[PDB]
């Protein structure tokens, strides 16, 4: 039945008025059923008949999943004010429980009273055979299914009702999600059982009932692709649809699941399969799997055959986070308390953008790990990073941007991340000095790039279809190429000033990457910038 | 008691800012601090019908080993009707010593307009989201809100009148929850005179928790160029590059004669003898640089900007201005003992220190341009924040030349 709870004042968005959608026309069979069903709801007090003084209306339908009504609140919702859960708990953050019992509060929505002032907008109508006499008209006295505000109001009411019980029994954990109530504890099975029944009766006090064993959920719990088991959690089986004909669409869907899975199974690859999309003309276009795609799709099936399980959180144990550099711009990490008993795993992908470096990327992965850790375990892990303290100290104390890594420790697990090179702080004595320069016609795109050294050496190339920036970077490239293991290079390029400060080791620009590789080849490189057009050849 | 009605600026709506993740420690404290405030009727639990939200967090002042609650009312403030408030005295910028007092407690004794309370909504989050957040809403004047000191104006002036009229020599300025007391007196006389105010205040109900500010130790330093016996091609080059840039601030800076020496393809290390002309050019630039650029005045009807550069080795430079190149103030900042390996800790201290000066000098917090990545700042700044206010800020990429120049600011011959 309806419960003696205080209703929540609810109102339509400022300005707008209640919905007025015309009632869809129904057949004899549809009407007959609705009439039946609504006669039931009206008796229970759920809905109440209304006279045409109510100008509002919403369309009701009849669907068989015996018949069952359905109200389309799309319009009313659009007009309903806004409310303030959309942050889901992650398995790795739950604490092991001796027992977990799940109570159902399904038709509790129809157990929570609606704001008597708002009820009027909820009006709907029951049509007649065809287009004759006026139909039956009702309105809700309780939170209706499908309305924007139901979930929120329900949640809040539930919280209020649970407050006293939560207080009396602090050693009991309740988690509400949808119309399920997950009650867990470490009490003795008999004691736990006893408390549930008390809770149950406490709820019954407020009208909210509970069903029979018929539909009583029991572990494992299938939740958001995870499998909740009492001692540990596993990942729900990821199956790859073994077919022979693959459409563009099919491929994309595949790449999706596979990308999601790479988090748990760090071995997954989709490059060879993510080439099958090149130049595709239609979503339904059929693509022949290349041999390399067969090989790739094949191995992933094996990987995904393996069972991967994680364990739960133990607050009495510290948090460890270990990171690995899978390749350039790719990182893997695992968070555990006991070695090999992972609470959570994951991986990070990067675009390399305009220009970064490995150490910088390392810090970013740390930050992301740190944040999610705080969200899940309210604590920040102790890090184990594949980088020496030496390298770190040499990089951050000089980097132009503020940066930091919480308490961490060096772990000798190859390949260690390191500084690929370091520009000299002072010019190299007894090294050739290249004065590089590049100029381009912004419109004709005809450029020239070259250099001249104190050593008398010189060169100049003519570039076709080029920009100014390129002729600049190109001049710097030529010097790097034509020089020895030690070089001094002066340029008036604003961009060189960029790499001086940041000394990146990965760029989006291929030219920059060319340069970086050259920069790495040398033993000593001193890069100097000077004002352009200032007659300082 | 009378509750002066407060209203949002026209066309504005309440804040709907997401709460940032908090650690267990901080959440436990807020729960503790809030249950207490609830009982005292300072705040009340609210429903989901209220869609607004402002973020909250917890901090611990210096020496303080007890958690204090801090709300980020920046958004609400920006949207709260102005008050046509408290004037600013050009005195304390001069005074020999200034002490800062937290009179934020005072507000809790004043009630807030019923109709406005909804906008003060905030949320204590829960670990791993295993429970719904706990939503509250203020019933009394909240700390950190700009409406607060404005409404408790009449009451503060009153309370202060006695002390003011007895000491017309001491300056008292109120900004947010802070109270700035400045005097030219003797350290002993100043400090002890504080207590007189302190107790005087305490006598009404508002517990008012080195530490002395010394305006006039904030003298703007000049830029000093290097001097050598011998100069190399590289030396001139670095110099000319720096100068050429400075000419944006000092147009009288010329570098034509030095550039002359740089014609030709010499080895960067090769020494070059200076000409009498390039020697004079250099003398003039030094001369020009001996003082801040003329004609720079504070315009009250414009925002203050504070740019900070990470120099390195615990060093930070900053400039305050309203228009690029026309600095109202500049300086350096060396890390506090203990910030040994934490860039964020330092930067945070720097911001607080810089902001405070902004308050004393102009009674306005500057807008910060921080040489740090958004993600990094948001993740850890609250871990070392110790002021009751929160400046506005944006993140930037420090131009190489800007820090090469200010790195050149003069320092004491010894200390
Ligand atoms: C049998 C395992 O159920 C998972 N589980 C649970 C129950 C549980 C079940 C589901 C479907 C989702 C979530 C987030 C939690 C709890 C609490 C919340 C009752 C707990 O503390 N610990 C735990 O391991």
Swiss-Prot record, chain A:
Changing residue 202 to Y: Confers resistance to lamivudine, pyrophosphate analog PFA and zidovudine. Changing residue 84 to S: Confers resistance to pyrophosphate analog PFA. Changing residue 94 to I: Confers resistance to nevirapine and efavirenz. Changing residue 66 to R: Confers resistance to zidovudine. Changing residue 209 to Y: Confers resistance to zidovudine. Changing residue 100 to I: Confers resistance to HBY 097. Changing residue 44 to A: Confers resistance to lamivudine. Mg(2+) 1 binds at residues 104, 179-180. Changing residue 184 to A: Confers resistance to efavirenz and nevirapine. Changing residue 213 to R: Confers resistance to lamivudine, stavudine, zalcicabine and zidovudine. Changing residue 86 to I: Confers resistance to pyrophosphate analog PFA. The record marks 434-435 as: Cleavage. Changing residue 228 to A: Complete loss of RT dimerization. Changing residue 213 to Q: Confers resistance to zidovudine. It is found in: Virion. Changing residue 219 to H: Confers resistance to efavirenz, emivirine, HBY 097 and quinoxaline. Changing residue 183 to I: Confers resistance to HBY 097. Changing residue 97 to E: Confers resistance to atevirdine. Changing residue 155 to L: Confers resistance to pyrophosphate analog PFA. Changing residue 73 to L: Confers multi-NRTI resistance. Multifunctional enzyme that converts the viral RNA genome into dsDNA in the cytoplasm, shortly after virus entry into the cell. This enzyme displays a DNA polymerase activity that can copy either DNA or RNA templates, and a ribonuclease H (RNase H) activity that cleaves the RNA strand of RNA-DNA heteroduplexes in a partially processive 3' to 5' endonucleasic mode. Conversion of viral genomic RNA into dsDNA requires many steps. A tRNA(3)-Lys binds to the primer-binding site (PBS) situated at the 5'-end of the viral RNA. RT is structured in five subdomains: finger, palm, thumb, connection and RNase H. Within the palm subdomain, the 'primer grip' region is thought to be involved in the positioning of the primer terminus for accommodating the incoming nucleotide. The RNase H domain stabilizes the association of RT with primer-template. Heterodimer of p66 RT and p51 RT (RT p66/p51). Heterodimerization of RT is essential for DNA polymerase activity. The overall folding of the subdomains is similar in p66 RT and p51 RT but the spatial arrangements of the subdomains are dramatically different. This is Reverse transcriptase/ribonuclease H. It comes from Human immunodeficiency virus type 1 group M subtype B (isolate HXB2). The chain holds residues 588 to 1130 of 1435 of the full protein.
